[PDB]
């Protein structure tokens, strides 16, 4: 048995342009076992219409999933991905930074 | 397309 904590990236499908629809992505990978909870947050609040890819995995057997939702970035709105996994004592939040 | 074959116990 192994435990591998997820790597997390949160980013947009296209370069963000305030006022323009886009997709907010949270890519979780490198994790084992496969149960994981991923929410995309808008100003600290769970975004309801979030979908995710079908569980798959990498050559080293670690899992990856993409969670995503349509969104329209603005100058003021903050977005984040919140991830929980057996390896995490508390949910981990990674803020969306449009420059990364 | 997928492999179709019998099951081999571990």
């Amino acid at each position: 048995m192994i435990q591998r904590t997820p790597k997390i990236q949160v980013y947009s499908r296209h370069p963000a342009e305030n006022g323009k629809s886009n997709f907010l992505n949270c890519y979780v990978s490198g994790f084992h076992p496969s149960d994981i909870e991923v929410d995309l947050l808008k100003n600290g609040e769970r975004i309801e219409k979030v979908e995710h890819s079908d569980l798959s995995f990498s050559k080293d057997w670690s899992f990856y999933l993409l969670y995503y939702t349509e969104f329209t970035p603005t100058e003021k709105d903050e977005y984040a991905c919140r991830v929980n996994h057996v390896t995490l004592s508390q949910p981990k939040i990674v803020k969306w930074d449009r420059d990364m | 397309r997928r492999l179709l074959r019998g099951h081999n116990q571990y």
């Binding site: 079908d54 995995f57 057997w61 | 179709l4």
Partner: protein, 276 residues
């Protein structure tokens, strides 16, 4: 050039919550083209790429049958693994299997694969000769002898050398407008001061397919490998991928830095700089 087809399968046991969740997906190169999830209403393998939709009902029926069968046999294999490892019925365990083939640019088999992992660790794998196995531990060595006796590798080899490449070639042809049309990255450099004395130069590669790409920063034509931050290539969610590489540079020296991008969708390697 070279191409691959892979089927990934994951069964996860769930003690007091029903049967193992079984999820399997198929890929040709970096394109997901089929998926089956046992937790679906009345599970069926479904297409995930346009070029596979044309396959007839018999294809889909056979695929779904195979998926359903594998979900069931995975449950047996998880029980066997539990037994081998003397593990409790109360814990969740994972059984993964990847198999598939790679073909060269001439469409001929380059390599076949069929390998398994239990709880995230290699368990047993078909070797490149497609006739012998690599068992990762003492339990897997037991399985290995069973599979040797039952001539499993011969059957896998038959598939890997025959149908696997045949169907991969078929998919490559039927989906050639996307699978064989590399989409080069859209690239640009951004500049982000981190103080008045340094700034991050971030070289972006977006919208590219397939995922393989190399992004490097040079300073005066010399690779800045040890000082470059590189993010893992990540899916954009529209079948293409993104990656960036960054370096922190002294303010004033930005123009000494160039980003170099290699991708099969580019005729020639790109060199870009920050263009304020």
């Amino acid at each position: 050039g070279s191409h691959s087809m892979r089927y990934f399968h994951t069964s996860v046991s769930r003690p007091g919550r029903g049967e193992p969740r079984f999820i399997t997906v198929g890929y040709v190169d970096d394109t997901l083209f089929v998926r089956f999830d046992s937790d679906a209403a009345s599970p069926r393998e479904e297409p995930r790429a346009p070029w596979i939709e044309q396959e007839g009902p018999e294809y889909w029926d056979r695929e779904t049958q195979i998926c359903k069968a594998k979900a069931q046999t995975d449950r047996e294999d998880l029980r066997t693994l539990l037994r081998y490892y003397n593990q409790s019925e109360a814990g969740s365990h994972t059984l993964q299997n990847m198999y598939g083939c790679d073909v060269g640019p001439d469409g001929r088999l380059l390599r076949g694969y069929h390998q398994h992992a239990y709880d995230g660790k290699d368990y047993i794998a078909l070797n490149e000769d497609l006739s012998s196995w690599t068992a990762a531990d003492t339990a897997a060595q037991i399985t290995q002898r069973k599979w040797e006796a039952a001539r499993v590798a011969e059957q896998l080899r038959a598939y890997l050398e025959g149908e696997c490449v045949e169907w991969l070639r078929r998919y490559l042809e039927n989906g050639k407008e996307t699978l064989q049309r590399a989409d080069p990255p859209k690239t640009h450099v951004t500049h982000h001061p981190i103080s008045d004395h340094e700034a991050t130069l971030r070289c972006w590669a977006l919208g590219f397919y397939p995922a393989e790409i190399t992004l490097t920063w040079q300073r005066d034509g010399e690779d800045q490998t040890q000082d470059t931050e590189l993010v893992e290539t990540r899916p954009a969610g529209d079948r293409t991928f993104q990656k960036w590489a960054a370096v922190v540079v002294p303010s004033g020296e930005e123009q000494r830095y160039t980003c170099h991008v290699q991708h099969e969708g580019l005729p020639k390697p790109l060199t870009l700089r920050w263009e304020p």
